[PDB]
Every structure is written in C-alpha cells, then in structure tokens.
Amino acid sequence: YSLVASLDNVRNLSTILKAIHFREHATCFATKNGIKVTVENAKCVQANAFIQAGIFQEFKVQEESVTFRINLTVLLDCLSIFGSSPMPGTLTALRMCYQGYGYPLMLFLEEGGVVTVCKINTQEPEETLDFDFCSTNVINKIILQSEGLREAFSELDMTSEVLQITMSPDKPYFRLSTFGNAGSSHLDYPKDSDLMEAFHCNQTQVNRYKISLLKPSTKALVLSCKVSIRTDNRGFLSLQYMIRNEDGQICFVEYYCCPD
Amino acid sequence: ELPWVEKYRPVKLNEIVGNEDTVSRLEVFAREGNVPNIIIAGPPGTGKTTSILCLARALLGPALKDAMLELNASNDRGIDVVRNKIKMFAQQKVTLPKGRHKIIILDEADSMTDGAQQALRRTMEIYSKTTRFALACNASDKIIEPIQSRCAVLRYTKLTDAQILTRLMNVIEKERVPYTDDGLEAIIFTAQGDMRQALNNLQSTFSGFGFINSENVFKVCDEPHPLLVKEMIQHCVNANIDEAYKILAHLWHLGYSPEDIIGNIFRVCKTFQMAEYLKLEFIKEIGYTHMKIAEGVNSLLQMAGLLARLCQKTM
Amino acid sequence: KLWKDLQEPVVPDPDVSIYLPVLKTMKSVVEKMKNISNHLVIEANLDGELNLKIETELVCVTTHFKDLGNPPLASESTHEDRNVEHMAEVHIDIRKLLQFLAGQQVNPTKALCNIVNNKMVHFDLLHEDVSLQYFIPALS
Amino acid sequence: MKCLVTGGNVKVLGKAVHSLSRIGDELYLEPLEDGLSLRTVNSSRSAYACFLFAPLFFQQYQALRCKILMKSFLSVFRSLAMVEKCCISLNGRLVVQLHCKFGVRKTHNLSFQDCESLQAVFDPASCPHMLRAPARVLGEAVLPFSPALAEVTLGIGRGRRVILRSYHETAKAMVTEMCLGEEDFQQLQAQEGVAITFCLKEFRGLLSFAESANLNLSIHFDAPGRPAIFTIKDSLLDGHFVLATLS
Amino acid sequence: ENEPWVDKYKPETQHELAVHKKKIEEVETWLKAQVLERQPKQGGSILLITGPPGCGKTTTLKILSKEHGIQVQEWINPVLPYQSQIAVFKEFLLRATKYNKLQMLGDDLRTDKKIILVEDLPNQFYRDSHTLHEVLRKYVRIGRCPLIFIISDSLSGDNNQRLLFPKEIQEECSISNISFNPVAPTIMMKFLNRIVTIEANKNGGKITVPDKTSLELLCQGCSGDIRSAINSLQFSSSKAIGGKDVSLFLFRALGKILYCKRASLTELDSPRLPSHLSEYERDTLLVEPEEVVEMSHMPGDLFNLYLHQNYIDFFMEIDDIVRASEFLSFADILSGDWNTRSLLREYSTSIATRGVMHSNKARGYAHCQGGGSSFRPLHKPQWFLINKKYRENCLAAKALFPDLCLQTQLLPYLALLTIPMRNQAQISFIQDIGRLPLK
DNA sequence: CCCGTATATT
DNA sequence: ATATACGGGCTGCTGTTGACAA
C-alpha cells in the first residue's frame, strides 16, 4: 500500500496542479515531508510545486521515497469531476492509494452520498535536470505584487519572437520590451510604488528570452498573490509564486528558465 | 571557434572565385544601385548565399539592421503570418538616400507551398518603388511560372580546377601549410566541384598528419566512386565477365550496399556512349535486378547474375 | 399522409423503472466524462442504484448513485424470481445524452427513467403543466 | 503635433475609434488648424465617416498627414483605454505614450505610410427633407432586427408616422415591419411616401457611439440615389457620416 | 532612376501596347458594345481572360477603360491583425454592385457605368472550388455590372484553372471567353530596339551598347514574355541570362515521342552491332526521352497509358507492334506493388518510351518520311471510364446478389437467369448485362 | 508535333 | 514574297505526416 492519502477539500490540490499544467506528463516524489510534482520542457524550462504534510490529515508512507509518472490531464479531470463551481457549503472528499511498483493508482471520491471510483495506471520514470539556484550567486532579486502585471502579462501575447528584460539601479528600473510586426512596446515599472516591496538590484542586466518557453507563466500569475524574480550572473531566470487556499495556508510554485 | 568551411568566408564581392560574368554584372549593379528582383540557381557549394548577402551589405551599409528582411526554411513559411509580415515590411516607409531600396531575401524558396507563392506574387509588382526581392534556390523547377515571369534568372555552374587551385593556394599561404603538387591534385580530384567539401577534406587531412602527400590524403579518408563503375560498364560491353566481376568484388568488399551501387550503375548508364538496343536491354535488366533487391533478396549472387545477363546480350 | 409518422412514440414495458437523481450533478459528471471517451454505460438496479461507467485502455471510471426511491411497479407478481441485485445495463454513445441534460434549466418533480435490456432508454419529465418524453436509442 | 488628453475623454475617444473601426479598415489622421480629424472610408468607397475634435486637450500642430492600419489602433485602445492620461505626437514614428496608475508608463511605436488627403462633398442645405430624434429611440427601434441583416429601408407612412422595414432581394427569411409614433420625434419635414434604402453596420456604429450621453441624431434624406447625411453635434465634438442609397 | 524599366516604359496611349491589333480590337468592341448598348434591364455577366504570363492582359484592359471613361473596381485581400473570408468577399461584391462612389476630391467625375475586376483570388476559393459556383449563381441572379476574371496559366500544370471553371459553370452560366497568345518575335524586336535606342540617346557616358547578336538571343529564350525580356535587357546592359524553364505542352511531347525526328547518320565513332545484329541498325537520334517526359509534368503511369492509346496508328508492321506491346507489358509489371511503387517508376516510363521509339523500324531510316503525317488529332485513354463502370457494377452486383467472385461465378448464372422477379429498378439492371450487341 | 488558309505589309 | 493566327485532341484511376480554416 506504500502511500495512502486522504483529504476533504480536493480544491487545494486541484488548483495547485492546475497552476503548473502545460505539459501532458508529470513526475511525482513522495517523501516523509510531502509530495513534489515537477515538469520540464525543451530541456530548458522547468516548473515544480510543493504540498507539505501540514495540509494533509491522513498521510501514510512506507519505508523510503516513492516515484512514479502520471498523466496530468487525466488526473486533473478526475479530481474535478463534480463541477468546478461549488456553492459555499458543499465539499468533496477524496482517498488515494498506491500499492507499490507495478500497480495503478486508486482514487475514491465522495460528495453528498455520491461515490466515484477511478484508477490511473502509471508508467514511470523519467530523468530531471539539476537546476540548482541556491541563493549564493544571485545578483539581482526583486519581490512584487500580481495585480500590477495581470493586464501587463495579459498584454503580452502578440506575434513577436523574443521578450527583452532589462533591470538597472537607475533609469529603466524594470523594463520589458516586445518587438513585433507593428512596433516596440515598453512597459517600464518604477520603484517607490504600491507594488515595490524591495528593490536590491546591484548591476545592470539586459537579457533576451523566448516567448514560447515563458508563455505558460500566465496560469501561475493569475492564481497568485505575490511574485519574486531572481537572476544570477549568467542570466538564468527564477520565478517564485505564492498561492493560498480557502482554509488559509500557503503553497509555493517555482519556474526556471534559461536565456538565449 | 568555427571550422575552416565557415571561417574563411569572403566579406567583399571580389573574393568569390566562381563565375566571372554574373559576379561582374552584380558588382556593377551594386555600384549603380537599381537592382531588379533576381533568382539564383546552381549546384551546391558555390556561394550563391554569400553573393546575395554581400550585395545586400554593399547596397545598404550602416542601415542594414532596420532595412533588411531574411527568411529561411527553419523559420515558418506558411501563408498567414508570412503574408502579414511581408505586407508590414513592404507598406512600412523608411528613408534611403538616393537609390537604395529595402531588400527581402527568401533562402531556399523551393520549399514554399503553392499558396505562399501565389500570395507573394501580388506584393512583388506594386511596391517596387521602395523595395526589391532576391531569391536563392537549388531546384528551379519548384518555383511556379508566374514568379519566374518577372524575375531575372541567373544560373551558376560547377567550379573548374583553376579557380579552386588559386583559392586553395591562397588558403595554404594564409595558414602556412607545407604542401606538394600531387597531393593538391588529389584533393582537387576528391573535391568534384563543391568547394566547402574540398576545404573540409584538406583540413581533415592536415588534422593529425602535418603533410598533404597523396598517401596521407588517401589514408585519412576519401575516394570517388563513379569512375570505377564507368570502367566496369565498358568492360561488360565487350563480353568480359571475368574482368567485370573483379571491380564488383572490390566494391562489395569495400563496404557498399547493393542499392547504392545499383543506383549509380543506372545513373552512369543513362549518360553513356552506346547504341540504342544495348541501352534498352541494360535498362531492362537493371530494373528487374533493382526490383529483386528492393524486395529483400540482396547478395553477391544477384549482382553476378546481373553481370552475366548484361554480358550475354552482346554474346 | 405523414400524420401517422409523427404520432407519440409507444412506451414498451420497462425492464426497470427508476427515479432520477438531481439533474445538475448528473450533467456535470457527464460533461466531465465527455473528455475521456465517447462511450458510456448506464446501469439501473432494483434498489435505486444508478451507475455510470466508462472503460478505456488507460483509465476506467465508475460513478454510483444510491437511495433512489423505486416507484411502486404495476406488476407485483413478477418479483419473486427476479434478483434485486441483478441489472439490465445498456451502453450508449455520449453525444446525445449531454444535450438532453444541458437543455434543462429547472429540476422538475417527475424525474423518471425507464430502461429496457435490448436497445432503448426512455426519460419522463413533468414540470408545472408541461410533459416531456425523451427517447434515446442504444447501440453506440 | 502634440496632444495631451486628460480625464474621462479617453473613454469617448476609444468609443469613437471603435465606431470608426466598425466602419472602415484604415485610419486617416489629419491635424487641421482647428483641431484633429479622424477619417475613414469603406473598401468600396460607399461610406465615409469623419470625426472632428474641437480643441479640448492641448492641440498644437506643426513644429502633417498620415494613414495607419486600423486593427492595431483598435487593439491598442481596446486593451489600454479602461488609464488616466494619453499623449500623441509624431517623431522622426507615431508615439502613443500612455500614462497610467502610480508610475506605470506604456509606449507604442507604430509605422505609417504617406497618403493623400481624403474628403467628400455633402450639401445639407440642398436637402429638402429633414428628421430629428434622440439616439436612444432609434437604437431601441433597431433592436428587434437580427444581427445578420444587410439593408434597411426608412420611410414615412400615411398619417405622419415613421416606418423601418427589411429589404429582401423559395426558401425566404423573416421580415420586420417595426413602426413608431410622431410624439417621440422632435422635428419632421417629410412627404407622403419618400423612402430610402441603406446599409446597417455603419448605422449600428453610429448608434453605438450615439447611445452614451443620450445625444440627438439628424438625418437629411433626399431623392433615391443621392447620399444621406448623419450629423452628430456635441459640446466639443463634431461628427459626420455619409452613406449611399439604392437607386 | 527610381523604377525598373518595366515600370518606366509603360504604355500610356493605346498605340504603345505590344499586343496584336486584332486582340485589342476584340476586347475594345466587347467593352464598347456593352457600354453603348447598355440596356436599363441588362443583367450581370462574366468575362474570362486567359493567357500565358507576361503577355499584357491587365494593361490593355486598363488602357481601354481609361480611353472610354470607365470606372474600374479592384479587389485587394484584407490584412489580418469572427468573419469568414467568403463573407467579406460577398459583402464587398454586394457593395460594389449596388451603390456608387460619393464625390471624392478630384476624379473622373462624369461616370455612371463601371466594371469589377478580381485578380487576387483568396486561398479558400482554391481549396474548396464549390463556394465559387454558388457565388457565381447568386451573382447571375442578382448582377447588374459585368464581372471580369483574369487567370494566369502555363502549358503544363494547369490544375487551378480547370479546377476553378470546370466547363459546367461556363456552359450553364453563359460566360464568354478571350484567349491571348505570346508576343510575336517582330513586335518584341521592334520594342526592344526602341528601348535601347532611347537608352543610347541618353548619353551621359561612354557605355557599351549590347551587341545585336545577343539581342535576338535574349528574345529567343523567353517564350513571348515582355517582363522577363526587359529585366534581362536591364541586367545585360550593365557591362543567355533569362533562361525561363519550358513546359513542353504535353500534347506536343507526345508528338515529339511518336514522330522520331532522325538524322542522316553523320560520320562519327558510335559503337556498331558487330556481326549478327544487322537488323537492329538505326540512324542517329536527336531527342532525349527522359527530359521530354520529365518536362511535361505528368505521372509516368499516365504517360504510358496515353502512349498505349496513341501508338498504334503510327505503325505499319505487325512484328514491331508485337515488340512494342511486350515492352509496354514489361514496363507495366515493374509497378504492381504498393510499398515500392514510387521507388522505381522512372524505369517503366523510360523502357516504354525507348521501346516504342526503337521498335518503329519502318519510320527510323532517316530520309524515309516522305510523305505522310496528315492532320491527325490525338485522343484520351478509354480505360478510365471502363474501370469506373467496372467498379460501380461491382458494387451494384454485390449489394444486389451479398450472401468479386459473384461477378466471376454468380454473374454467369445471372447472365443465364433471364427470368423475372419482384422489383422495379432491378429488371433494368438484368437487361443491362445480357443485351450486348450480337447478330 | 502535323497541313492548309486568310490578312497586314513591302 | 514573308510573318502571324485558326482549326483538334486532356483533369484522370492498404500507411504516416503535414498545412488551413474555425
């Protein structure tokens, strides 16, 4: 039975998974501290999540860690099978069991007397990169809100091919540039605003990024309340989000991308 | 850094050692500055793209970044986005001093679909007062007739030995490589027209030997195939099966698949000097043998039987 | 000449007659089921159990409903040899069921389903003063 | 050229841009000695819409004529006119710098091509007939019509009343016979059967812009064949629309 | 010094055109008879203009329209940054046909008659080819002003023109036809001479005028197309160029294969058949079959069918016919699979062509072609209709006696059935197969 | 490819 | 006495990957 997990609010896990859903497959990691689902694409972009043991009520694991690969679309569809619009006062409960290697994943859901049973067979594993972004070589870091860039990143889907990010202590403190068919489009963000919680950039940094790799950050930006931007000496970009649930807990999602 | 095939690229227009007429006319046109749209064709390894890029750079100069468009096959060329971007670039106005115009280059245009070309042919006859085109390709039969019906078609040719030798001598003098006449003749023999191939072969030979003696060139690998089959066909013309099988055995022991040999046999047979009856019968036998080989039964005995059947015809 | 061909469809003797659940939850479940496959199986029990099943080569899903009141059947002498745990399930293509659930906007008080073994499923609804008879052919 | 728009005028400017986009495919910008002029013409040149903006923001021309693809402007002002200030100039590029909340600044550089001066010829004085009414009444009068209609006919019935119909040219479609009363309109100089036939989409854009502050329209229709005129007057905003009539 | 010579020496007046006078007169009389006899009740009409590229179809129409004061309406494809393309096209067509321009500011004002010219057809019209028929039917029903269609076509590869107008809409919609021809050598010669004289009179510097001997070479390798001729003249006058590819006009390629232009065996060192192959001696050939077949732009299995249809009439002996038939059969055998059908296809066509060419010993003796080769037209293979009839009759036999073998075994029984049965549409089928002509 | 015919022009 | 155009014959008979209009 290796790992069994039970919960009464599927929405937390469902929204955490939906915040990272742009590929088709995902890899899990069950450890005494909790699960960790990661995904990679183009051997450059990598997105990971974290669901600590504090959220869970009935969590049981056996011996060492457990790894398996699961289709994300099917799991996300199965989780939200009772409608993604519940009125206040209605909840859904789920139970999941994984009985070791070579056997599928169970999922029993219940709500108001209706009981559903589903199974997802897993064919694992893959290999993941080693994107180590420890806070030792980080040179430029910023922390900022989300409602500022809701429309900004919404006003970012054009027929361009490269997004230019420049950050400097003076003049264009945080400028995004997009070169398309019509013309340039600058979106300068200054300091000392309502969305400037800490500015600590050291030296000027201008870099180019691919639109195709960096596009799926909209889903993480929409379901968030704060965003942290980090870039090191070489020019690798690290994005840290902060999502909350109905109960009042906090979960994190991280994105790693490499420059052109 | 880069290898010798991409580092020794000409930056001017007089370093090109290909044809002599078209290059001189292009230099004159770059001097004047009223070029029409052109379509360049020819064998690979000549320098068509180099000529086009050098002409564009000479025409524009410092304003090349914001007045030039380049499109390739890796970049998507469908219909919608390409026509949109092309019309943006054509309708957009820029300032150019006297007679310089905007340049649109579409490399390997033979890969485009019919829809893209049919949408493109409209933009190439109206905005001619501020823009011009330039196309490079390998097979000129792919481009539709209406597009050719308003372009100047320049056709290149395979390089001869003299220019190849001159530029090879220039490279050797630049790199200070001790040489020998017969070794350079062997390298030119291995080149067979294409020039980047010759430079790559010379670099490979020089890698770990330090000399371009003929023995070193042949030892480090390569060797041209067709001239061996040309003699073999002549041998089977005179009913000499014993002498014919020797070259086949040599090639088979060399490590060549049956299909690769049988294709070259047909290709050499078509452009030969024989009668009509013999050519017909040879084509028939090669066709039957190729069908058998493609069906899966490939071995030495089938090639020997093909040679015997070819020799039987002349008795 | 065609007046006979538009007559009200006949209702044969139902193998099982069962009260229907709330329409909104069934509609949501079916809508989420549409993505996985284009085949569905509906099963009706004699103790008010309604089962919706899909079985693919990768995922298998089954949804259960219980505590559905069985209406008093007219034939009370044909239940001494029929197993209560037996069923007369059928399989249908999930392209016509979803329209029928999506069209409805208010839940009536006469939600009934008549299921037969061979090739027919039939729905009865009545709201205010309007009656609705639904006929969905089987054999997807 | 330098214009600095401040206040709620941004929304009405965006609405005018949307109406022009609903009418035409290209936008002609002309700085006159008395303000700014936005012009648009249909592809077949059967309709012409012009907005003249009385000096209201900072108007100062010369330090002078351009045309632009209209989808770009439409997208920019659909996604960026919901915003407290706007600045327009002509560099050399067209700068559409847009000040926003706090300190966010958005700039938009666009490409333009040289064009000719566009104008038309209309004679409102020469038109005998004349009709005036609030825009809301007309907008309500065109609501029952399906959104797939092409041509509409306006007429005056027997008994001093207005009538709007549906012109159709054996699987036919529905027809409409909407009729109104004289007590809603404010001014009618008409006749005993004079009617005109025109299009609908440009009329719908006109009504859409005219249904904001409850403005009053003015129609000067003439004998069939001659163009019709729709004139909208406001405090600091003038607009004129010219259509064509079936002969 | 800012436009090409193509755009600089455009014909302003009618007399500066490079088209034969009769064609200009024909277009002019059509247009002017429409204008002069413009009845108030006249409906719409469609005119079709064809021709090889670079002959001058658009310019002559524009010049003739400007001479007689006619408004013209163009159609430029709209530029994307929901409505279908066909919807926009029909809306533009209705607006252009119904109403008129307003006043503009400076035009050719005194106008009430106009025509609509459509050249840049949308892609969806090429892919579908069935929306166009409905659009044309609606226009014929509700048309006022004529519609002129301009198409560019080549000798081989004419799929788009026949796909767009497949001989049925023209027949049932009353569409006219006007076809152009490539410019004659003399007209192009005179115009090129005029242009080079104008350049020479410009003076400015000592520039080498292009030689006369290359000037006819420039016009020889262009095949009646003015624009490429002017482009090549501009390129060559900087101090042959312009090798446009040929299409060979498949019906001409068939005649080239089937006529076998031979030589008188000029003294050379070609190999000879030594002792016993004395009946296989042939005169020298001056044609390469591979290039001819490739240049017609046709599949090989179709070329072989056409050759099989048309090769009998040109033969005079029976033994040569036997040899040619054997060669054609052997060419057929090599393409009978499906996985390797496209890997080896050149062999079949080459074998068929060379066998048909060499087997004709009666024709192949140089000066032995006098006299014959009358005015004879070629034809089309008859195998297509027979195969389609075979397939439809296959289905009509199966599904209706389903309880190929039925046609091979049961259908003989049907042929010996001849007795009535209970149906109406089946007696006709019974009488179909079983009533072949026989005395 | 193939044969014979009607019009512009010197 | 020599260059140029009419007349008559063509759209047609299993698998794996890719672009377009909605």
Ligand SMILES: Nc1ncnc2c1ncn2[C@@H]1O[C@H](COP(=O)(O)OP(=O)(O)OP(O)(O)=S)[C@@H](O)[C@H]1O
């Ligand atoms: N005429 C030439 N003179 C000198 N070098 C040449 C010439 N043609 C080709 N080369 C060499 O070829 C190298 C690369 O060839 P390219 O010009 O890129 O070939 P290409 O003209 O693009 O034709 P493709 O792409 O193979 S079809 C250059 O670095 C030159 O050294």
Ligand SMILES: Nc1ncnc2c1ncn2[C@@H]1O[C@H](COP(=O)(O)OP(=O)(O)OP(O)(O)=S)[C@@H](O)[C@H]1O
């Ligand atoms: N005497 C002449 N006759 C015709 N065109 C001329 C002449 N002199 C110069 N030109 C130029 O040649 C152009 C003719 O363009 P063409 O491409 O031949 O017309 P077209 O008939 O539309 O060809 P398509 O559409 O590709 S079949 C004119 O627009 C002029 O710029």
